[PDB]
Amino acid sequence: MNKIIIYTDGGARGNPGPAGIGVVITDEKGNTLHESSAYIGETTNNVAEYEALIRALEDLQMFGDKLVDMEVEVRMDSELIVRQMQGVYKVKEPTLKEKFAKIAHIKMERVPNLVFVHIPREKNARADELVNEAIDKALS
């Protein structure tokens, strides 16, 4: 690849309730490099979104040597979370502050040139499907 493009989503059925994460990773041509779909136990929606980012950052380690000097972009359909991750707006929700700090440190350590991009919800349908696949399968 010449770029790694990541889409993430997380959701919960309830507040809190059964929750899932979805990560899609492509190259610059749009071809799939990886998908993650996982049940994460019972949490809130916003925690699930943050957990999906943490999982994407973990997935990235599996590229190993290929990660060096590689351009990485994370696309999310939550403008709020993108602005939070960019440091444009401060996180207020107390339940997110520890994960926010953890993500910031991981991203600096593993991928300090990572960029975040806000996309429309329609453009994030695959990651959403992965969330719901994981939750459905856990409940079934």
Structure-token pair, residue 106 = 């991981």
C-alpha torsion sign, points 76, 97, 132, 53: positive
Residue entry with tokens 């972009």? 73
Give the pairing type, strands 71-76 and 3-12.
parallel
CA dist list (Å): 129 to 17, 39, 53, 98, 125: 17, 13, 16, 27, 6
Residue 131 · residue 21 · CB < 8 Å: yes
In the PDB record, what is the listed experimental method?
A: X-ray
Stated in angstroms to one decimal place, the resolution of this structure is 1.4
6 close to 70: Cβ distance less than 8 angstroms: no
Structural domains in the chain, CATH included, are 1-140 (3.30.420.10)
The amino acid sitting at 7 is Y
